[PDB]
Enzyme design. Structure first.
Site, mmCIF file in Angstrom:
data_model
loop_
_atom_site.group_PDB
_atom_site.id
_atom_site.type_symbol
_atom_site.label_atom_id
_atom_site.label_comp_id
_atom_site.label_asym_id
_atom_site.label_seq_id
_atom_site.Cartn_x
_atom_site.Cartn_y
_atom_site.Cartn_z
ATOM 1 N N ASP A 35 28.880 38.844 42.447
ATOM 2 C CA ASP A 35 29.989 39.796 41.740
ATOM 3 C C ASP A 35 30.009 41.077 42.314
ATOM 4 O OD1 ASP A 35 31.656 40.756 40.263
ATOM 5 O OD2 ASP A 35 30.540 40.813 38.183
ATOM 6 N N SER A 199 44.866 50.987 47.329
ATOM 7 C CA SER A 199 46.101 50.094 48.272
ATOM 8 C C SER A 199 47.384 51.125 48.336
ATOM 9 C CB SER A 199 46.399 48.547 47.370
ATOM 10 O OG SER A 199 47.523 48.167 48.202
HETATM 11 C C1 R9J Z 1 30.487 31.277 33.390
HETATM 12 C C2 R9J Z 1 31.084 32.550 33.412
HETATM 13 C C3 R9J Z 1 31.723 33.049 34.917
HETATM 14 C C4 R9J Z 1 32.356 34.124 34.758
HETATM 15 C C5 R9J Z 1 32.565 35.160 33.777
HETATM 16 N N1 R9J Z 1 33.217 36.219 34.012
HETATM 17 C C6 R9J Z 1 32.464 37.519 34.550
HETATM 18 C C7 R9J Z 1 31.807 37.332 35.832
HETATM 19 C C8 R9J Z 1 31.191 37.533 33.367
HETATM 20 C C9 R9J Z 1 33.373 38.775 34.445
HETATM 21 O O1 R9J Z 1 32.877 39.736 35.033
HETATM 22 O O2 R9J Z 1 34.356 38.587 34.009
HETATM 23 C C10 R9J Z 1 32.024 34.589 32.844
HETATM 24 C C11 R9J Z 1 31.358 33.459 32.317
#
Ligand code: R9J
Ligand code: R9J
Ligand code: NA
EC number: 3.4.23.22
Length: 330
Positions: A35, A199
């Site tokens: 992330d 951008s």
């Molecule tokens: C399983 C899962 C997968 C992704 C998210 N979203 C995240 C990465 C926490 C965000 O930054 O909005 C939440 C849960």
């Protein structure tokens, strides 16, 4: 040093991507969501409340000969979808794609929210934003990238996400075989702890390019492309029967539609997102209303170049003293 790991979509929509990560000694392999919009490396663990674990692989620090409690340290995070997790902290050896960091902070979840619990395919997140956003208290910790820097051949990582296919995260090198043409680099602000850039504009389908500055973040952990309401309205106006649905939570369109492409500017360069990438399929199983992959950022407070945008490009996250982003077509 370098590392290279394959990243794989969790489902048929490319809702997220998972990358195998080795933690501890002997290795415990967990599949983490890399992330670039956050800065914590956290995992489901032997400490996670049992009712909040449903199919995820867990990290068990007591089985790692190199794990050590980071005494007194806690963490607690909230994401843009309103999901959350919190816990305590170990240091341990972490390897990605053959690149090893010793002494990495591995944030062990005691509590995760229901979105995490319900997603059996994601064992944790590995944050790749700037370490200023890391939530560990009282001693903030460094990201995997920030700890590996000392050591990489070049202070970079690259994201090469696939459309309905695996892709690659590389650390410490540019794979000049992985993109076409040249890489266009653009300035980054680290003031909010993100890979924040501007951008130069957009086009809808075969339309004229609109030169307009759009600040936003490069966020591998966000599925969709979130842009100002003006831009998003202009896109969906080109799809017969598309509308913003307050009940569904964004723009929907007839599943019978063929979507136009969307182009975004990177300096004088252009990245084209094919129309197909903007299809997120039926809003509920069997529906003929489909969810759009371009949505308004109004109320979110920032524009987000999430996976819809990033998987159309080869993206360089340049962590040199003055960070920059690079984009190439592929
Ligand atoms: C399983 C899962 C997968 C992704 C998210 N979203 C995240 C990465 C926490 C965000 O930054 O909005 C939440 C849960
Ligand atoms: C500060 C600023 C930056 C950009 C724009 N243009 C927008 C509204 C994104 C557009 O739709 O073209 C307007 C103001
Ligand atoms: Na959704």
């Amino acid at each position: 040093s370098t590392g290279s790991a394959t990243t794989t979509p969790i489902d048929s929509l490319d809702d997220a991507y998972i990358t195998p990560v080795q933690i501890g000694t002997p290795a415990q392999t967990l599949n983490l969501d890399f992330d670039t919009g956050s800065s914590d490396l956290w995992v489901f663990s032997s400490e996670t409340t049992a009712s909040e674990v449903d199919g995820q692989t867990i990290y068990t620090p007591s089985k790692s000969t190199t794990a050590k409690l980071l005494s007194g340290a806690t963490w607690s995070i909230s994401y843009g979808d309103g999901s959350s997790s919190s816990g305590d902290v170990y240091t341990d050896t972490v390897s990605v794609g053959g690149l090893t960091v010793t002494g990495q902070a591995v944030e062990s979840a005691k509590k995760v929210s229901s979105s995490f619990t319900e997603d059996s395919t994601i064992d944790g997140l590995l944050g790749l934003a700037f370490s200023t956003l890391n939530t560990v208290s009282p001693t903030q910790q460094k990201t995997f990238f920030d700890n590996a820097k000392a050591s990489l051949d070049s202070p970079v990582f690259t994201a090469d996400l696939g459309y309905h296919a695996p892709g690659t995260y590389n650390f410490g090198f540019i794979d000049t075989t992985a993109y076409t043409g040249s890489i266009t680099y653009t300035a980054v602000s680290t003031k909010q702890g993100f890979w924040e850039w501007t951008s130069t504009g957009y086009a809808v389908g075969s339309g004229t390019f609109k030169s307009t500055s759009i600040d936003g973040i490069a966020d591998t952990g966000t599925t969709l492309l979130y842009l100002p309401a003006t831009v998003v309205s202009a896109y969906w106006a080109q799809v017969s029967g598309a509308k913003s649905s307050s009940s569904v939570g964004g723009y929907v369109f007839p599943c019978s539609a063929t979507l136009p492409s969307f182009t975004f500017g990177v300096g004088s360069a252009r990245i084209v997102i094919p129309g197909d990438y903007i299809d997120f399929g039926p809003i509920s199983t069997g529906s003929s209303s489909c969810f759009g992959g371009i949505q308004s950022s109004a109320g979110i407070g920032i524009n987000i170049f999430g996976d819809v945008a990033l998987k159309a490009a080869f993206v360089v996250f340049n962590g040199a003293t003055t960070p920059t982003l690079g984009f190439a077509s592929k």
